[PDB]
């Protein structure tokens, strides 16, 4: 008679129906990604529309069960996602035009290309074509031609499409009783219903701003180290107290600095750790790469992989006859069906990638006992963070000497470890200010604090303050930098990259303290230790059925994000950068410009 009995009955039947259609919808996308055919492209749209319209029809009966009469926490969380009507709250005209803008911006990004200024006949697409050239290009003009001319026909063209993208998504949040669309992405961290563990949506703005303050002293020493290496090339354009150019960051948008690791090597007289040449002599194929990584999950106490997982894996691309996407991705269909689509070659990166791709599958096995509505990560940052901590332990010299990749006589000292910590810093340390910059910019534009004319005015002004990057060619309001970005144009979460760094280092410190590892943190290895896998397995099976603030306390003992593991893991590198930057100026100024002298 109570609403709780009626709500639980609706959720018991919905978990079965939603699980059957989601499996067929994910299976149609699997056959389309592994094989390009005219039958698979239609099955993906057919099975995709049946599951998309299924949540819309069940949303009508979900809003008829108010959460005020339900005293259960697990029931209100399952009805929290079903209570939202999605795009049904928008008008019929705005709902149909919303999918058009998303498909148009995604098509222009895929079909966009920059023709060679010297060779007008040859025109190369961005991915892979332009993204590959910008990695190894040391030229000043060659990098500027691809970086500047892209936003001319893309950033300027996507500006009217981005203006409509802001207006349409703001009307959805207003009908959902949200302050703005920037608050919509902050609702993933929302926690209510438990005394003392409640987490407000507006708290994330103060959290990412406060944790970034302690990141500055670590980032300023690394930014001055990279600038000192490239200062001798162009002393006129690169000022010691100034900022680095935008096109020299190693790629188009400057997301990762790993491309600059070649010239930034502190000591070139010492060898580097590489498993590529070691796997050639051992004669290993794609079958034993996942097999050796499966034993890593057994040593920590986690269950092994099912027979259907290894049998259905796609280990290569059979030429151009049957084409498959080589971008590594872990696809979770349902009902114990786990598959991964990746093109596996023999490289040092594919070894660490195998631990990351199998990390998502191993992460899905713990909470697989939960209902379909309760199967998910506790947030958007925990998805990729679980797979990264598996690769960090594999990249240590201790794990490589265990299975025989690295020779046991390899000398391990400060000179070898500082070279390894610098490569990870370019990917990690360089990501946080860039992710905090663009995400905070989206929150300000979606809120309305920045007029349409000041989009680019505040973009580059706040860029020199955060990441210390200035534009070689000044841009007007016609250009839009985020419009060309993969995550913004495809409507994917950009905040998951900032919080991932803080969550993965907390888990790295907690698991090494449970297994009683001594010494620096980068020397830790979680293999052969079954004590750390037991404390982690308790949280992995919770998912989002429990508050992420409560599940985080059960591992690291912290109720929020903390920078302490970020500084301790980078502490050996921070002490070396401070001594080398004494001859230079630590920090940068925002008043310097390459075209303003």
């Amino acid at each position: 008679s109570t609403i709780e009995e009626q709500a639980k009955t609706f959720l018991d039947k919905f978990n079965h129906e939603a699980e059957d259609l989601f499996y067929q919808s994910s299976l149609a996308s699997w056959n389309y990604n592994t094989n390009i055919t005219e039958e698979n492209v239609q099955n993906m749209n057919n099975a995709g529309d049946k599951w998309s319209a299924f949540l819309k029809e069940q949303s009508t009966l979900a809003q008829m069960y108010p959460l005020q009469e339900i005293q259960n926490l697990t029931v209100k969380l399952q009805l929290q996602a079903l209570q939202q009507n999605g795009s049904s709250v928008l008008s019929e005209d705005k709902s149909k035009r919303l999918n058009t803008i998303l498909n148009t911006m995604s098509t222009i990004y895929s079909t966009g290309k920059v023709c060679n200024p010297d060779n007008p006949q040859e025109c190369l697409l961005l991915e892979p074509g332009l993204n590959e050239i910008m990695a190894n290009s040391l030229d000043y003009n060659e990098r500027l031609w691809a970086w500047e001319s892209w936003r001319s026909e893309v950033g300027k063209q996507l500006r009217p499409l981005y203006e409509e993208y802001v207006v349409l998504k703001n009307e959805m949040a207003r009908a959902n009783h949200y302050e703005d669309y920037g608050d919509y992405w902050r609702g993933d961290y929302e926690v209510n219903g438990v005394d003392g563990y409640d987490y407000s949506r507006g708290q994330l703005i103060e959290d990412v701003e406060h944790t970034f303050e302690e990141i500055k002293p670590l980032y300023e020493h690394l930014h001055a180290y990279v600038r000192a290496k490239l200062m001798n090339a162009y002393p006129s354009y690169i000022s010691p107290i100034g900022c680095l150019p935008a096109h020299l960051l190693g790629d188009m948008w400057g997301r990762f600095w790993t491309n600059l690791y070649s010239l930034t090597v502190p000591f070139g007289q010492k060898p580097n750790i590489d498993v590529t040449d070691a796997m050639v002599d051992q004669a290993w194929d794609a079958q034993r790469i996942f097999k050796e990584a499966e034993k890593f999950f057994v040593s920590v106490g986690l269950p092994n992989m099912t027979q259907g997982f290894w049998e259905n894996s796609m280990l290569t691309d059979p030429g151009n006859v049957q084409k498959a996407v080589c971008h590594p991705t872990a696809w979770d269909l349902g009902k114990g069906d786990f598959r991964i689509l990746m093109c596996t070659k023999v490289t040092m990166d594919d070894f660490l990638t195998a631990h990351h791709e199998m990390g998502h599958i191993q992460y899905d096995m713990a909470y697989a006992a939960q209902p379909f509505l309760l199967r998910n990560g506790a947030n958007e940052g925990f998805h990729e963070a679980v797979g990264e901590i598996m690769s960090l332990s594999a990249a240590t010299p201790k794990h490589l000497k265990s299975i025989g990749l690295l020779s046991p006589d390899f000398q391990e000292d400060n000179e070898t470890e500082i070279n390894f910590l610098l490569k990870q810093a370019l990917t990690i340390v360089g990501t946080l200010p860039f992710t905090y910059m663009l995400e905070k910019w989206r929150w300000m534009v979606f809120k309305g604090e920045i007029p349409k004319d000041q989009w680019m005015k505040k973009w580059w002004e706040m860029k020199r303050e955060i990441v210390g990057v200035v534009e070689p060619v000044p841009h007007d309001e016609t250009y839009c930098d985020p419009a060309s970005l993969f995550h913004v144009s495809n409507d994917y979460s950009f905040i998951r990259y900032y919080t991932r760094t803080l969550y993965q280092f907390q888990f790295q410190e907690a698991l090494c303290q449970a297994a009683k590892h001594e010494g620096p943190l980068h020397k830790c290895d979680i293999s052969n230790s079954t004590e750390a896998g037991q404390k982690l397995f308790n949280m992995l099976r919770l998912g989002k059925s429990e508050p992420w603030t409560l599940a985080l306390e059960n591992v690291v003992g912290a109720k929020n994000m903390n920078v302490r593991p970020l500084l301790n893991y980078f502490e050996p590198l921070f002490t070396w950068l401070k001594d080398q930057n004494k001859n230079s100026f630590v920090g940068w100024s925002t008043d310097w410009s390459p075209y303003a002298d």
Partner: protein, 97 residues
């Protein structure tokens, strides 16, 4: 390797909802629509009215743990009737003298 086929097998169903728990050794084939709340159903699907029978998805691609298992349950009951069924016997060699 037998029941599951490509495309799914909807022939095998199960009763998801019932007003109470079944008694031991009871079989209920009634297809009557289950009524969750006080809203009248009258065989028409709608609010608080759900069709109890649901389908088992059967394909070879599902994980091993959720693969369907054919279960044969033998009920052993000793009544006051004369015993008939017994275990197998064994015959030995015959010797004389």
């Amino acid at each position: 390797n037998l029941d599951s086929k490509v495309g799914g097998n909807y022939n095998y169903l199960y009763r998801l909802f019932r007003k109470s728990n079944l008694k031991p050794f009871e079989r209920d084939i009634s297809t009557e629509i289950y009524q969750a709340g006080s809203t009248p159903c009258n065989g028409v699907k709608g609010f608080n009215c759900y069709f109890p029978l649901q389908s088992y998805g059967f394909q070879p691609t599902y994980g091993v743990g959720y693969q369907p298992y054919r279960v044969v349950v033998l009920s052993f009951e000793l009544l006051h009737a004369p015993a008939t069924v017994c275990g197998p016997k064994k015959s030995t060699n015959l010797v004389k003298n």
